[PDB]
């Protein structure tokens, strides 16, 4: 159920080469909170990749610590998928965490690397969050 302590979800960004604004994925619930993948271009140059948590809530008392693995799927060989691990205490003043320079933009969009196809790039996140605080008293 949504109370699950961990989960893995993906988000495929279309017309990736033309990305200009930051894109948001639908929500994935774990620990009963909405988690999303956030992608945006940073300086062409590099791919910004972040994990967002409970950002829609107007609450300022909640907090949830989690560890996750942020990965950019390589459709030609998952062994060549690039991923980085994170650990962070999520709360309103820091509802997202990740890397603004997660990968080189020219590399991810390289048709010969196997990360991009039909101008689509799939993002995956494996999050393992602890019980939250300041939410379900």
């Amino acid at each position: 159920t949504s109370w699950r302590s961990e989960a893995t979800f993906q988000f495929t960004v279309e017309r990736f080469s033309r990305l200009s604004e930051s894109v948001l994925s639908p929500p994935c619930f774990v620990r009963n909170l909405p988690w999303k993948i956030m992608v945006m271009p940073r300086f062409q140059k590099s791919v910004g990749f972040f994990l967002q948590c409970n950002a829609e809530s107007d609450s300022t008392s909640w907090s949830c610590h989690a560890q996750a693995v942020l990965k950019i799927i390589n459709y030609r060989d998952d062994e060549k998928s690039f991923s980085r691990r994170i650990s962070h205490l999520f709360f309103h003043k820091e509802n997202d965490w990740g890397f603004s320079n997660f990968m080189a933009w020219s590399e991810v969009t390289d048709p010969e690397k196997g990360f991009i196809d039909d101008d689509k790039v799939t993002f995956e996140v494996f999050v393992q969050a602890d019980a939250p605080h300041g939410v379900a008293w």
Partner: peptide
């Protein structure tokens, strides 16, 4: 690189 928030 080093991790942070999108902000």
């Amino acid at each position: 690189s080093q991790p942070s928030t999108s902000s």
